[PDB]
Structures are given as structure tokens and as C-alpha cells.
Amino acid sequence: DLADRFAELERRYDARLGVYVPATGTTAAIEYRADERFAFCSTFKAPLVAAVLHQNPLTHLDKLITYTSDDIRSISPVAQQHVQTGMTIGQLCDAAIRYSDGTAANLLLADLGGPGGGTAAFTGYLRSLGDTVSRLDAEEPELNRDPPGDERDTTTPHAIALVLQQLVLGNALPPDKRALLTDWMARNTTGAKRIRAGFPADWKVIDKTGTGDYGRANDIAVVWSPTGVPYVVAVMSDRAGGGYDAEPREALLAEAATCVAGVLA
Amino acid sequence: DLADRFAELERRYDARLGVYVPATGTTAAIEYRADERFAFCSTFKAPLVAAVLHQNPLTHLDKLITYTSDDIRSISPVAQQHVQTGMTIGQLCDAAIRYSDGTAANLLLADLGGPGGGTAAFTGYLRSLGDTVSRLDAEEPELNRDPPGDERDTTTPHAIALVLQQLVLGNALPPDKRALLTDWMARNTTGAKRIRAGFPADWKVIDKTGTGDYGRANDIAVVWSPTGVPYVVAVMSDRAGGGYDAEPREALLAEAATCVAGVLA
Amino acid sequence: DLADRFAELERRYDARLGVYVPATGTTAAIEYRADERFAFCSTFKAPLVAAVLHQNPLTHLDKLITYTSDDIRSISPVAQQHVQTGMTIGQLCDAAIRYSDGTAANLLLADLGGPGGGTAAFTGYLRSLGDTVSRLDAEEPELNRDPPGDERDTTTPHAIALVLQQLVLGNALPPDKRALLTDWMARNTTGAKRIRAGFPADWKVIDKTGTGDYGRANDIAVVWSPTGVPYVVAVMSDRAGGGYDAEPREALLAEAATCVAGVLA
Amino acid sequence: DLADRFAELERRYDARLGVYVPATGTTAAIEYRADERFAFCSTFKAPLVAAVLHQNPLTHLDKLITYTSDDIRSISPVAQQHVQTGMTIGQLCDAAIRYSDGTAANLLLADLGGPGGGTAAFTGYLRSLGDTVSRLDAEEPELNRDPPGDERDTTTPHAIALVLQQLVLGNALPPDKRALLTDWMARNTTGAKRIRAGFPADWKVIDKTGTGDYGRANDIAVVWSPTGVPYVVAVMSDRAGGGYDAEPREALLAEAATCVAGVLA
Ligand SMILES: *C(=O)/C=C/N[C@@H](C(=O)O)C(C)(C)S(=O)O
Ligand SMILES: *C(=O)/C=C/N[C@@H](C(=O)O)C(C)(C)S(=O)O
């Protein structure tokens, strides 16, 4: 009967809440709008880094990439400060995950190559991981402002949680590459008020946030209980009824994570 | 059903969980063995300090009390450093709440005066708050050693929660005296791994812990939601099956408070 | 003295360092190459929006400005996503201060009006604050790429400090317009590795950075001691011996700010 | 001329200040009352843990130590909650450093073995490292209330900084034991408003604090530059002119640390 509390949070925040938690040997899966489509936003930056790491040897992280002023089309708090110096693949992976750097994600997508600047190649990496519903059709910041009902650049809480499970807890990556992604998400600096704020301090939380227009605000995370049991939590939400200028509500994601924590205790 | 999760941690930690959260205008009351009798242990020092504040004026806190080395009976991290100087009533209140000092509580009990070192006077104060169930018959450290089934020095999560609601949230004390009591519990240094560990960091938590033999571990608390809504959480537990030297499981209290936080979210 | 440490980092980083801390009532004035001219770079946007605040009332902030793709010339993380909808006056101020948007600054210069994109109007506001030395002649991205020795688009560490002192601590703007200017500089997102990284955490730091070619890296800041004492710190630097594409060294600005924080404590 | 700022801090805070920083290869040695005697306070718990580490193998840290209520003679936030279950030697080393547990330090002194609870063995360990000035004669908390002028339980900022240098940067311990002591001092929870508050955030600071009567406030630490250069900072202070109940001033230690940070920059 956890769907009642989730439905009450939707009424309180005027939002559509989507929550999925994969099942464990001891607990059942938590599902609220798990198979509904929400916008990817910056949450695609976590499997994108894994895609770059998967198709390249570890030595590729030192390849320097140079870009111009016209490449910075969205908020890039790190790419903005290295236009003259350039950036390696590893620095692009660090900025895309920890600071949600918009330009870093577009260069990482271009590093994947192929049509669409790497969007079709990234979606192919999800299909190889069993993901059958997610899709990425544009770059930043276009993928954030898709109209409601448009299935472009959307995923499901059920789909993105399984992808995050194989990248961190599964064997989709070797231990050396998987340890790089886990450390990057563990030091994320944009999710202090989302899933991290809903879980107690003794719980470990690595995450990658995502914000867009129409009040969109998601956060995919892997949590560790104080005893050490790992759970994957996928929380996504939008407020498309409020319009394009709808303000996201980070408290809804923090409140939903507090509901999930009581069930996982 | 929260009672099912409240019935698993008993089997998981081999304990007897007692939870009570007084109902508010928006939320219902959380009950699990709420009317079952649990030992006061060191939690009685919260209504004990409020008793001294109730009968005595503000200037009574500056009254010095002397004591010899014979009066130090239980754990007294502060009393073992003022045997030559003595402590004023205010210091004994600060030591009894924040550090759970055993000798300070015995001195505050004798400060109430009466039969048995101020125990009957203490129970008499509990009766004025409408609590006719709880009782205190012994002094430190004998009240922690009462065998199970015995009703001496016992209380219930139902009756101690309403008492804390009257003292901290109600009008049991005038505002200037109530501000002093809340500050001491807000700076408690013995409850980091109990209710404070089970609630998210953005929740304010004041508490007074209680430990004892037979695996007794209690924590009565008044928590505040990130929006400012106040609740009262009373969690008590023991493991009488493990014998006299049963080990108290602090993780059971912290894990129980997370369940309460989920429903209260 | 401080001048010898200020003469060491220049050798450590192969740069030309310029510091100025205007004297307050308590301590003296820290000066090192204070009157030597350094490039304005993106630091001119701090007094720019203050000029737009001064000669227009508060209702002018709501004025909409429509622009095309050809107007995007320098880096513009915020201005590049509002080509169809346009931006307001206040939105251009927030983007030019917090994100150092080049397009927003070139539009703010045009909003002040006048000849040559209104650069003389900008300097037409500096002498009114007493600044005789500083000058601005070009728009982005041309003011950043002036050759060394040229005096166009230059100020001095002595010249832009007292203006920042007048604009944050003096009486240059009314309180209604002062609150907005200070808030925008406190939420700056382009200078976490400069003066902010040099001062301890308990020091409030508002700033507006500036970076350009020839290894030019500036940061003007108003810091507050843990006790509430305000100070104006202006650190400008270039590397005019390494070519047009010399790498700017942010570490020198953070080390110089630490060398300023020592005497101020 | 850095001794001029240390004197003004002595004048402003009404306290005697002791500061020593051992000279590295690039910088010189910073001294201010470095050879004067200051009380040990809780700073002796850093070499005490290293003493137990040095005299015993790694698996000795798993030995369970049991104690009674009488062993809690000072503030012991960790030992007070483990009277029933007991504490291992590894847990005693953690609590003595991170939480400055009083009972844990006394038990570790007994683990060293020797006359008067093992204080003669701890002093002998300091003589082994080359320290011929420091001395420990009392236990907790008697070593904190010594009168001014007494050499009992005192060291010097010059001697304690050289002891801490070999224990962390030197090779007084093998890398396995040395990594445990460094990790414990890195996660200290009692020095937030002392040396840590005086250094920029991008400097890594491990430390152990000390506080006692007569306004005594010490903090020994090892800091790391943003580039990775290590320095040892020993800051001690008292206010013995203010009497037994003289309040300590943590801001004096934080302000003196900011002066050292600017010189080491
Ligand atoms: C994730 O990829 C984020 C984009 N950032 C959003 C934000 O809330 O800052 C936008 C859509 C507003 S942006 O293009 O900066
Ligand atoms: C508060 O009054 C005390 C509970 N005392 C326990 C403790 O953990 O300190 C005992 C059982 C150890 S005690 O009889 O002091």
C-alpha cells in the first residue's frame, strides 16, 4: 500500500511521480508508474559514460579533445573554463557526471560517433543492455525541452533502473572501468536535495540527477544500507500540466525517497 | 501494514519493539506494543528535569549542591569531575539530559524530595500530566536492572510519548522553562545511533536515550519535518530472551525510526 | 613582506600578478602592481549591469529584447537557448554576471545605448564613480583579445576595486538595486577555483571573473570575514610572454587570494 | 614578521599562543613560542594510538576490552554506549581520535602497560621518537586541569610537531599501521572550528584536537597543499590568566591557521 503515499505526493506537488526499485532476494520491487515514459534529461549521462568506457580501452581517457566557443550551447560549468586548454575524455566524463556539464555530454556523444552525433550509437548501447524502450534523439539542451506526450528522449523508471543496475552492480563493465563510474557518481555535486536528502546519512548514495523544462526533475541512484545491501532507486517526475515554465519540485523526489527508505528498512 | 515491518525487526534482531507516534491533525497514530510496559531506563531524566523546573523558580538553577564520593553510583561522566566543587541545579540538569549522568539524576530526584529519594514525588508529577501508568520506584542504577514482567520503574511508549508532547509541544511548562528543556535535549550526545540515525539529515531531532540490562534500549524523541511539522516518536525495546546480559541492538531503534519516517513522509 | 610573496608566485607561475585590497578603517591597503593596466575581460560585466541598474528604474528589468543567431558571438550558455523567445533586461543581467554570457553583455551595452555598441557610455559611467583610468572600446569577444601594451579595454587593480567598493559598500546604487547586484555576484558559477578557492570556507565571497587570451585571468571580489568585516579584493593577471594562446593559470589567483587572507586574519 | 600577527591575536583573544611548523624543503620553519611549554590535553591521543600500533601486531586490534561503569570518569561518547558489549582495541583507537573519547584513551594507556596506568610507557615511546621534552603523568581527565607553570602533562609546539611528522610523514610506523592512524585523524569530528576552519577547503587537513581548563585549546595537524605538498602545523594556546573557568577561544586557532596558510601559499 505504498502507492497511496506516492499518489498523495502527486496531489501535494502537482506533479506526475514515477518510481522503480529493482527486486532483491529479500525484498519485492517497488513500482509507481514504472512503465510510464518520463524524459531522460541528464540521467542519460550515466549510461553515456559507460558507453564511452565500454567501447574504448582505458588509455582512451587521456585523448585530448578541443572545442570552440560555438560548442557551448548549454550550462557547462567546466567546459566553459577550458575552451582554450581543451579537455581529455576523462575530464569530459568527470564533468558530465559530477557537474552535469552540458558540453561534456555532447562531446562524449560525438566521441561515440555515428549518425545524429552519437545519439543513435548511445541508444544502441542501451539495446545491447536489454533496454528496449529508452531512446535518445537529440543533444543538449534540446532533449530537455521535448513537449509532453513526445516519446523522444524519454525512458521509463523501470528501464533506467535496470540499466543502472548492470553498470554498477552487474557485469556490464570490467571492475577497473566500473570503479571509475561508481566513483564519479559517488562524488556528484547536484543531488544533495533529491534522493540523498530522503535517505539517512548512514546510507551511501551515488546518483546522477536530471532537470528539464515542463517541471521535469529525475534522479537515478544506487543506495547502500548501513549493513551493506545495495539497492537501485529510480525516481523521475514532471509537471507538464503547469506548462513549459513549470518549476520542478526537488522536495517531491526527496519525499518519495524517504517513503522508499522505510520500505527497504 | 506497518505492523508487519514492525513485526519483522523483532524477528531480525530478536527483540521486543515498542513504538508510539501520537496522532496529529493530518496523520494517524503509529502503534506497536504501545501500551506494553517497558523499563524507563535513562529516559526518565527528561520528565525529571521538567519536574525540577515546574516546582522551582528560575533562580533555583543557581543553587549549588555538594556531594561526596559515595554518592557516585552509576555512569557519571560529569559528576566525577565536580566532587570537590559541586554543581548547581542547572548543571545537574544539563548533565542528566545531554550526557545521561546517573549521579545528576539521583541528585535531581533528591532535589524533588520525599520518600525513597524523591521517587514518589516524581511519579506524582507524572500523574499531574494525566499519565497514571508510568512509575519510578528505584534510583540509579537499580532501575535499569529490574527483571522482565516486573512493573517497577516501567512505562509504556504510549504514555511516555504523550508526556513528551505535553512538555515539549504542549503547555506543561512556561515558554522560558520549556526553552531550557528543549535545548538540553537538542544537544544530547548519546543518541547518534538511534532515532537520530533513522531520520534523514534535514529532519531536526531532539531525544533522550535509555539503556539497560536484558538488552534494553529506548529512545524517546521529538522530531521536526523539513517543513516544520512536529511529531513525537517513542521507541522502546528489550531482549529478555537473551538473558540478563543480553546485548542491546541500537540498529533496531534506528531501523524502526526509518519506518516511521517513511509513513510520516 | 607581502610584496615578496607577491613577487614569488609571478616566478612560480611565469605570470604578471596584480593585487589591490583597498584600505578600510582597521587594516591598511595591500597593493602589488596596483596601477599597472590589466585587461577588463569578463570583469567589466560587474559594473556593466550596475550602470544598467543605475540609469533605469526597477520596472526596466521586465523589458524584453529579441535577438537573432548572428548576435551570438562569444560563448553564451544562457543566451543561445532563448533565440526564439527572447530575454528580459533582468535575465540578461543574471546571465552576464552568473554565467559570464558574452551575448547578454553585448546586449546590455546596447541597452545602455550610445556609439559603438555604447562602450563610451559604459566608460561614461566609470568617471562618474571617479574611475579615470579604466576604459572600454570593444564588445565580445574582441575586448579579451587586445595585444599587450595596448590600453584599450583595460583597467588596473587600483581602478576596478574602488568601483566594486562603491557598488557594493558605498552609495553608488540605492538599496533596491543594490540587493539584486549583490545576489547575482554571490550566485556566480565561474569562479570556484580563483579567489573563492583561496579564502577559508567561513569567509563569504562574491565575485565576477574574467578570462581571455595571452593567459589573462582576473577575479574581482568582495569578501567578508567570519566576524562580518567586508573587504574588496582585486586580483588580475596575464602571461604576456607565452604568446596569444598562453594558458591562464587559475592556481595563481587562488594562491594570491590565500596570500591576501593571511594579513586580513 | 609573522610574529607580529601572532602577538595581535594574543592581544585580541587574551591568550598565550604557541605555533610551530617544521621546515620543508621549499619553506622555512614558522615559530612562535615554539619552545614554550603547553598542556597536552587530548592531543596526546594521536601518538598514544601510534604507540599501541607500534608495540603490537595488526591482529591485536581485534582484542575485546571489557570495562565497567567506574571506568567512565570523563566524557566518553563512544565508551559510554558499550559497557555491556565492550570495545575492541581497534574501536578504542577510533574513538580516542575521532571523538576524543576519554575512557578509550585511559584503556589504551593500560594496554601499553606500566606504572600508573601506562603513562610512563607512553612517555617512553616519545623518548624513542626523539622527544626529550614532553611528559605524561596523569590520566583522563586529571591531565587537563593541571595548574599553569606545572610541567606535568605538558609538551611544546616544537616537540609535538616533530613527533607528529615522523608518525604521519616519516616511518615510525609501517605503511599498514601508518595508514590506519592517518585515516583516523582524517575523519576527526572535533576540529571543524580550529585549524580546519583556517585553511582553504581544497587543502586536506588531518588533525587531533585538545581542550582543557584555563582556556586551553590545542590542535595538532598535518595539511596538504592543493598540489600535494605536506606540512605539519602545531597550534597550542591557553588563557591561564583568566583562571580555571576561563573560556577557550577556538577562533584564535582558526585565525592563526589562516596566517600560516598565507605564508605557506
Ligand atoms: C540535464 O541534462 C540538464 C539541463 N539543465 C536544466 C536546468 O535546470 O539547469 C536546463 C534544461 C534548464 S539547461 O539546458 O541548463
Ligand atoms: C541512564 O540512566 C542509564 C543506563 N545505564 C546503562 C548504561 O549503558 O550506561 C547501564 C546498564 C550500563 S548502568 O546500570 O549505568
Ligand SMILES: *C(=O)/C=C/N[C@@H](C(=O)O)C(C)(C)S(=O)O
Ligand atoms: C568574459 O566573459 C570572457 C570571454 N573570454 C574567453 C573565455 O575563456 O571565456 C574567450 C576565449 C571566450 S574570448 O574568446 O575572446
Ligand SMILES: *C(=O)/C=C/N[C@@H](C(=O)O)C(C)(C)S(=O)O
Ligand atoms: C581533551 O583534550 C579533552 C577532555 N575533555 C575536555 C573538553 O573540553 O572536552 C574537558 C575540559 C571538558 S574534560 O576535563 O573532560
